């Protein structure tokens, strides 16, 4: 019985932005969650709808892994029923969530000399994101009452903004890699279990 490639998402040399959060499908393997909970390398390991102790000796049909990078101050927003620029516009979680959230510091990897301005985030949307929805649209946002046919102007700006991610930053503005596991059991055989 092959193990789950979890070191494939947690040790993924590159991560994605929040407006384009990568999604992995994990199945046909055995996963040891007790190793990840006691790793002491994650600053935040919060679970919803599932007891992490009882999570190891449990089975699911398909588990999704969403990975992205945010500010330290915005790790609070990756949770069910949150409000903010991330939860409303970047990555939303459903009220009936049955998956965990795992975040850790990544200053050495995602912040270099002179800054690392390659991670982006959504700043404007005409409506809030639905649960597990993604929006990568670079359509200029109509902040005012005057329309704009995809042309920059007053009250019409680019909806994407880059993080600073300087090495000598504060913790709340430091790069933090976060992976959200989704535990879904549909009408299918359970194939991801633990020891």
């Amino acid at each position, epitope marked *: 019985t092959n193990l789950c490639p979890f070191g494939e998402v947690f040790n993924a040399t590159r991560f994605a932005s929040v407006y384009a959060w990568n999604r992995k499908r994990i199945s046909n393997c055995v996963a040891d969650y007790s190793v990840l909970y006691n790793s002491a390398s994650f600053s935040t390991f919060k679970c919803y709808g599932v007891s992490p102790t009882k999570l190891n000796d449990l089975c699911f049909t398909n588990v999704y892994a969403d990975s992205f990078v945010i500010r330290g101050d915005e790790v609070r927003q990756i949770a069910p029923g949150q409000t903010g620029k991330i939860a409303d516009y970047n990555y939303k979680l459903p009220d009936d969530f049955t998956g965990c959230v795992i975040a850790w510091n990544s200053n050495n990897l995602d912040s270099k000399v002179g800054g690392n301005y390659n991670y982006l985030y959504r*700043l404007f949307r*005409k409506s809030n994101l639905k649960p597990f929805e993604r929006d990568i649209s670079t359509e200029i946002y109509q902040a*005012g*009452s*005057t329309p704009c046919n995809g*042309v*920059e*102007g*007053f*009250n019409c*700006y*680019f909806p994407l*903004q880059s993080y600073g991610f300087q090495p000598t930053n504060g913790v709340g503005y430091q790069p933090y890699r976060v992976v959200v596991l989704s535990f879904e059991l549909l009408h299918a055989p359970a194939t991801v279990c633990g020891p």
Partner: antibody
Amino acid sequence: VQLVQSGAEVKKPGASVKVSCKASGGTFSTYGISWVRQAPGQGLEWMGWISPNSGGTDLAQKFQGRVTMTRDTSTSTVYMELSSLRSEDTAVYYCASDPRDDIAGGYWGQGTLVTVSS
Amino acid sequence: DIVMTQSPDSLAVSLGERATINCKSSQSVLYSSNNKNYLAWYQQKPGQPPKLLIYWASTRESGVPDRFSGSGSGTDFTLTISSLQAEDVAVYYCQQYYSTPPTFGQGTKLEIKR
């Protein structure tokens, strides 16, 4: 975090003026930078908006043919040109910040006063 | 072409009293999507560029005293100073950023009454 404009200068009618608005301590690209002119002893008259990090302008109808807003080659500045100067163009020109950006508090720049007179 | 008209053109208020500056827009400044009035208040002392103190017609810019306060909705907006001081003697403009182009008021020059 503040905006420093160019030095005040004087010109004759029909000449061209180029006012440089440099943004120090960061960039205002999140909401852009606008230009407001104020005739001495008169109100505030909006002129246009520009995006410093990318480019592209938005102008008012009364200045559409005369104003020329330019992005910086470097040093994170913003420029603005005005040709076919009339005597009524004598005023102080400010580069304003958007009221709703919290990255840098609502602060404008020291207005470069230009005077057009024979 | 949203005209901003303030009343009165000039105001004289004694020290320690309250000053009320009225501002009326050409049309409503609230939007249907977000019930926010796209109205702002500015103070301009004669020496230097203006300083923003109120945006969204109620929220105060950080760094200003509690004397100033944004009020009103729709097309009626009032700026209120609780206790007039000698330092905050200037001309005040109301400006909307609801539509393009943004337009300011004609100005209300505030002076101390003695």
